[PDB]
Amino acid sequence: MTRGRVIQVMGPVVDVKFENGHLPAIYNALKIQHKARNENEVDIDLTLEVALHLGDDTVRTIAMASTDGLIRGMEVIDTGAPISVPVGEVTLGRVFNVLGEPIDLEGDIPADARRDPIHRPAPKFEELATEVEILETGIKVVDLLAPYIKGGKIGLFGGAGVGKTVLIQELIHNIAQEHGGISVFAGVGERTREGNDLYHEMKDSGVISKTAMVFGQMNEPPGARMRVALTGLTMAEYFRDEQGQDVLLFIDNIFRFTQAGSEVSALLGRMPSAVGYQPTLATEMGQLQERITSTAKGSITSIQAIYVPADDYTDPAPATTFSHLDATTNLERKLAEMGIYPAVDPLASTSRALAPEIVGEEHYQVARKVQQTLQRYKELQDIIAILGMDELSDEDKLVVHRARRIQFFLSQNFHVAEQFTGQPGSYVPVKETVRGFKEILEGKYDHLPEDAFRLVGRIEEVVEKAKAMG
Template structure:
């Protein structure tokens, strides 16, 4: 009583036909709450790849000729039939958050690529970032958002975000040279870009409240305006004198300055 949650399960030991219908059944429930009860619905899917996988198994059982990488020939229409029902009406709305398994970490695989085409934003997790101990291990170059538009987020937010991506992309393109020849072979401008990119990487780590037990850092809420201001200061070179470690697991740029001072005292 009083619960606002409806759960629909399709476990991996069930027939593919049943699993292929789970996402559609859950969406029908969401549409009922939206259209009949006028609710704004939050629709979670974990994992949308299982919907594609079940569809591929059903397709094989029906004897259809598979398309790329063995997926069903109707992959695009199957995905569209699900995703395009997730929409707003004058009675209510459905907002969907979906976990997407990426086979072999290949973002061009037809299953995740077909899903991405329907989403307003994607947050891509990267193993290489997690291996550096940076959490959440979000890849700012592969992640996308249609809301990153100056008409939506404002001119300053947009320009700072794009400049952060440019610095990180330049650093990524220089990594082979650094690995083979070392930092000494870079131009002075490239050395500055690399130093700022490494600070940005560490500043992208976030001390979550839910991750306190793992990170050992207290959780912090940071307003978006402070985040934008902090990144602008880093890319403008205002904090090139701070050590890279000062930017790890902090909230605002002021926290990084305090951490740097603490490191200096401890040394």
């Protein structure tokens, strides 16, 4: 027996009564499909997720869509499993909602396709990789000053016009090209206009065929906005586990995931925690983040955009989120205006991977020297503005000369920018990046004009560009 009946409706919260001894389990999915029996009814197609067992054979659920038109007593069907979404090759190039139904107009997935449960325990202790491994992205600034970790979490900070979408597309392209890994984009709390724009941008760039997109739109209920991240993660885990790939997972804004959790907790009536957040804030964040790991046969690495409430980094949501991060990438509007199109702040961005134990002694030393030079150049700005370049000492002039060239060499020509600029993109290995920056620091190219460093790949292209100019 799997038939229940609605007994209470209070907004997005629905109570369902089942036959004794046949209650559905927690996190199970319930389906309501109703056809209007007469003119005083409406059609219903709704999904519910079990949250609590209230006793007396009743279950409290949260709705995945609007509950308007529900009537007490209508039939509810228990599916016997959590929400299940299609996985595999079929999901590449498609757009889904939280339930795994295609949102685009390309047609629906056949019913015989494999579907995996959304809720599952994290990988066990002995299934994890024992050593830390660098993920090579092919982007000079990221690979030098803030290396990525296979299976790590990276926080992404920035505004609107700083090229976040372009950076995401370039990461997808480079990973697919050089490591053979797919990407998954999880739009938690996505605005519909921006989602349409992002879909069209990805289709224009051509990275759409290597990525699967899941959108949880803002006008959807808190349960859906809470479970979108998990359905995207489930989609990525198939490629980690079955195909043994290295997969990228993008989360549109994880603060919205925490806020949806808070809203669901308030709806269910639990006592609020410190700043009004749910009591289970850390547990929910852990259950999400602990599944993004590196195993013996693959890894999932995650880039997450983070919103900080009231610019308070001590706020509980950012504080819990930062407890899982391994790196940080900052996008700077000042660099964007100056024309550094990767726009990554070289001094604000940090990474725990930048340590000689795992990245290498030469890499570490070159990175520290670059950061020191740019910090000194940052300090000299006020005196340069006041007294001019000529009033500086000779070693300060040398520092400025090196620093401007380093700053320009941190830029790069992206593959996804070819459709606009006409210039082919480049993939630069970290060894080439380190060697080029070492040569610039040693003064091997002090005589070249600074514009030769603008948008190139390896260091030899700087020489070629200078020769082409004259």
